[PDB]
């Protein structure tokens, strides 16, 4: 099924998003497609996003899809 992009460590406020931060899984409810990660690398979260957290559109800066 439809996987989304989980955050693989904690992601802190305002950091650049690298690859080593985002799994990808299938949860719910469903998140950021996990094929548009590629596209969020050096994007910048608005929040600090805990471990094992689905990553959603209004978290990141500039994220359109």
């Excluded at 439809?2 to 299938?26: C, D, F, G, K």
Aim: hydrophobic fraction near 50%.
């Amino acid at each position: 099924n439809q996987a989304s992009v989980v955050a693989n460590q904690l992601i802190p406020i305002n950091t650049a998003l690298t690859l080593v931060m985002m799994r990808s899984e299938v949860v719910t409810p469903v998140g950021i497609p996990a094929e548009d990660i590629p596209r969020l690398v050096s994007m910048q979260v608005n929040r600090a996003v805990p471990l094992g957290t689905t990553l959603m559109p209004d978290m990141v800066k500039g994220y359109a899809a």
